[PDB]
Copies of this chain bind each other. A is one copy, B any other.
Amino acid sequence: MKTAQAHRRAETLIFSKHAVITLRHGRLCFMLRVGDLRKSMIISATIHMQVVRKTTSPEGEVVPLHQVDIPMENGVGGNSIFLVAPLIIYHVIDSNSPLYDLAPSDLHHHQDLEIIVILEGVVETTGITTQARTSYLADEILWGQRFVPIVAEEDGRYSVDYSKFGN
C-alpha cells in the first residue's frame, strides 16, 4: 500500500499560478489552465470548483468558510474532463454564480474570497484515485487577461510549449 501510493502522482498534475477573468461567447467567465506532465493518463478525471468565502444568510447565519460549488461550463453539463494537453477550465458567470458581483475594484489582497479547484481521477497505472487541489485568492485572479495558445502543430504532430504555461 506504500508502493501503490499516488500522492507523488498528484504533484505532476499542474495548475497555473493565477486564474483570469475575461469575456467568452458574449459572456463573462473565470478561466484557468490545468496541465498534466506525465505521459500516462488519469482515467475518469473530474474537476470541482468551489468559492470559499464567509457568507452570511439574511436570517442571521454566519458561516466562517462557506463552500459553494461552481459549474464548469462544460459542453455536456457533467464535470468530466479529458486531460492530455493543458486545458482552459472556465466557469461562466451566470445569474446564479456566486461570482456574479465581482469587479476589478474589489480584487485586492485583503479580500474575503477564495476559489478552490479540485481535480479527481484514477491513475491508469496503479488504479488509485488521486486529487490535485489548488486555491486562487482574490489577488491571484488577474482580471482581463487571456491565456496564450499553447498547442502548435509540428511537422506531423502537436506540441505544447510548457514554457508559456502560466503566461
Q: Are B131 and A43 in contact (CB-based, < 8 A)?
A: yes
Interface of A is mostly: loop
Interface size class of A (residues with CB under 8 A): 35 or more
A82-B50 contact in complex given A64-B149, A67-B87, A75-B70, C-beta closer than 8 Å: yes
Q: Is A61 an interface residue (CB 8 A)?
A: yes
Could you mark each residue 35-70 of chain A with 1 if its beta carbon is under 8 Å from any beta carbon of chain B, else 0?
000000101101010100000011101111101111
**19 extra interchain contacts, Cβ-Cβ under 8 A, other than A22-B59, A44-B129?**
A1-B3, A1-B4, A7-B124, A22-B61, A43-B130, A48-B80, A61-B146, A63-B149, A64-B149, A64-B152, A64-B153, A64-B158, A69-B75, A70-B75, A71-B76, A75-B98, A78-B79, A122-B129, A124-B129
A residues adjacent to B (C-beta < 8 A): 1, 3-7, 22-26, 41, 43-44, 46, 48, 50, 57-59, 61-65, 67-71, 74-76, 78-80, 82, 85, 87-88, 98, 116, 118, 120, 122, 124-131, 146, 149-153, 158
Nearest first, the 8 A-B pairs at minimum CB distance are: A64-B151, A69-B75, A69-B76, A23-B59, A64-B149, A127-B128, A68-B75, A65-B151
